[PDB]
Amino acid sequence: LTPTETAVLRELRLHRPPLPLDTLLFTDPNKDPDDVVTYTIAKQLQAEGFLRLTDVVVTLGDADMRSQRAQLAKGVFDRLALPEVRVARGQDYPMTSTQAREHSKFLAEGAALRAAPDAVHTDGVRAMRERLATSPHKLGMVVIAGMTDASALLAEAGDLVREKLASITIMGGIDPARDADGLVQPDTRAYNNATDIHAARALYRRAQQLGIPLRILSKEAAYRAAVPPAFYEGIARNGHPVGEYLRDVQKNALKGLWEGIQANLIPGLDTAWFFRTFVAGAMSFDAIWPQVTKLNLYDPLTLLAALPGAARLLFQPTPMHREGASPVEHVGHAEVVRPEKARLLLSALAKAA
Template sequence: MNAGRRAEETYNFPEAAKMYEEAIVCLGKITPQPSVRSRLLPTLRLGSCLRELARYNESETVLTQCLSEAEAELAEGRGDEQMYVHALTALATLRQYQSKYNEARELYERALPIARRVEDSSASLWLAGHIAGYAEILRKSGDLPSAEKLHREALEMRKERSCTELEMAVSYTQLGCTLFGLKRYQEAYKQHRLALLSRFKYLDFSHGLVSESLNYCAEALCALGRSEDGIPLAMHGVEIRKQVFGPSHPALAHAFSILASNYHAVGRSCDAKQLLEKCLAICEEAFPKNHANIIPNLMNYGKVLRSLGNYRKAREVYERSIVIHQLNFKTNQKADQLEKCRSEVKELAQLEAMSGEDTPDIARGVMPIPPVNMELGSTPIIVLTDVGRDVDDEYALILLGALTRMNLLTPLAIVTTLSPARQRANLTRGSLDALGLAKVPVGVGGSGGLDGNTPLEVYEAQYSRSCSCIFESGINLMVRALESAPDNTVQLLCIASLQDAATLIRGHDKLFRAKVKEVLIMGGAKIPFNTSEFLEPDTAYNNNCDMVSARFVYRYCQEAGIPTLTLTRYTAYGCPVSNVVFDDLVKTAHMVGINTRRVSYEGINRLWHKVNLAAADPRREKLPSRCDRQWFCRTFFGKEDVNRAGDSGTSIWDLVTKLNMYDPLTMLCCIPEYRETYFYWESFFVNGIQHRVTGISETNNGVIDSALLCKKLYSLFGLSLRNALQNIC
């Protein structure tokens, strides 16, 4: 029994069912026969596990047998009233899962008077659970005012008995769902957030109950018009449920539905459509035909189809919802739901008649450019990145999340460059969504100057997202972004090859001159010897990807009078961060923080293995011969050597003290206050316009105070990840 309960607590229902079956067999061999409670308890638990596994017919057989036995024992005077109540409510909960609400209600109405009468040392908490169970039946069947009253009664009983915070979280969740149904969304969010905080405090972030609270918080935020905040929570909820429940469980379908609602609310209906189709596929397989739980998902799907112009299919979806409603609910039960469906059918029929043919997915690939509010002091910015090559690009996106929330920057567009640019766009899209920047459009840039047949690696992330809202032409996206911005306001941040910047300028010179106020470049520049010379790019990696484009961009900006700021690798060398930063950010539980740490950990250990191989060893791949063990130790440890083996099974992560944050430092320089506080600059004037470089050499790295700068970076990284998860940690 104890093993079964432990398995249930971790949502391992198959294992729990197996344990209870073994317990039942063992009890059957005991003589004399054990008590009713001892005999029925494992059987009831087995029935409940089968219910959670959506094996409703098997669950019904087990629980019906339990109830019959409990009734018989009670009739003969040997019964246990508490077990009888358990049997009634377990079967009632199954009926609720089967959307047989009237039967469920009748069973609870038989159980609750007995439960209120029973005297027991723990009766109040036991009774509170059954009151809440009955309230859930009322909520699901549409009697929300009565459900709220009972949930508040159960909550007060639990408070009086000083039950655990995790037990209180159950009441917060149930009351939150009821308040949501009553359209009191702010109150609902408050209750769900209380539940989430308690569960995060005591359970692993990967626990199924944490995912439940994440989902409900996301749902409430969506209803409050805060879908961009809801998306990170819903994304984490989906990933947890994939791991806990598997790919075909109704719990995952529910998470898909909530994430879809949030995407639809931010204008990404194509993403919502894909998720709802996955959701409905699971529901059709897991639930009996015409199950009431399918109705909300169908209604969401109909709403999304309507927004995409597919009026006929949307109407058919709502018509099916009406049929299922009428099969499951009595007259006046959930009347608002039925009326909404009928109203939609009528309106969609009219739209069909007016539009003629369907125009499905009319919004595919189209995302609006975020509005610029100059009154807030936020600077519009376009970012060119090769995210996925190494983690500092993604850390720049994390930093962008913080600076956006602080109203310091307004990202208009992110364009990925360096082949395979589309895969980088997918990673960027998912990362931005998880950081609460779902409204920021992403576009696919060029190859970055590389041969398209030799793409560089893009590291994996479970949140990487291929979707139709990604602009296939990053250049067109940047043009739209510039056109939407006020004159002389936009910062262009280049933390990758300058090829796409050059392409944009060549094709849209007049627009670029009118809109761009400065260009920030992570790379390097040759310092001119006199004022008659131009600043030119050096051989830094980003420049070398396409040196022709790099020279063009630098020369163009100086001739056009557009200021440039260049941050070099020497600046990054002057402000290395240790492994502790990565390890600490994992504690936020944010998927981006966890994944970037994983990528860094695996990458640094792979490199350690390679540098310990002989120079001619093919397993070094294209690593230069100068990159040997001594180079590695100096670069990442700040030492000549360490006492650690170089084989592939050895990790050196714990020794790493020097990891370079090239791109986040460049992102930080977008903020005038930060660039003046943390960096020294060399200034050069061309036609009266200032161009600045920080980090002109290894001995003059441009960093004013390395410790202070690292502290600021760490603070902003943490702020971004914690805020994306609504500061639950």
């Protein structure tokens, strides 16, 4: 609605690509208000011809947990005017007791969003294999979740998967130490890398050995491109059920944090820290909420970096590959040169849809 967001949106219009790009997506929805933002901006981009979502994959749960996650994702897509994307369940991966306890997370607000319990598909990456084999052009792969199914897809038919893929975009981390053979290994601290370390190592090694370009996004890109809270109110002002859902979940998470930080329950954090990275005694939250300006969006920046059309507009990838190796580059906090236009794109292509 603001003139500058319309101007940057028409600039992006003028910077359109000639052919839409079909992307394969792996997500773990209903854990944070981020993946729903990614879905919304992907839909809005598809309506503009930039991209075209084909299939999605759910992860981070047990059989029933992942079934429910896929059901909710299908419901969100159906109510987002996207009745084409196929929802597919993942495959089982090893879990520890602590890991199982923390991966059984399921917020109650998403219970109503689940669609009819028959449209879900519980096969896996079997459908994606056929489309990848018979696709007349090249596809890109975006990973913002666990790497299990992604590792499974690239472990078979190396020639096929290297001849019909463009690049891989992942939100994760890079271990500072080089591999024994000079390759680049994922670190153990990143959440996506820590979901399944073996699958992450296999993905990185296979991608670097198969010649597929690799796109890696750190966690500080959102720090450089934080969003004001008026974005949530703007999207939810019109009574959209999805926007209401994200507003509710963000409010719930923020007030849970604000109550937890009181009475020093969480070690290493105090009231001073909250006012540092979220603002610039202990009152009610209803007065704390207006004075926040630095909320974070992590995975949408990965989707933005995946598309080469908008990659050059605001990012600046830094090469890190050895002279003899597959092209791999990392985008961090220093590579984002125009955070203002980044926030403008998030607000624009999330508000319109």
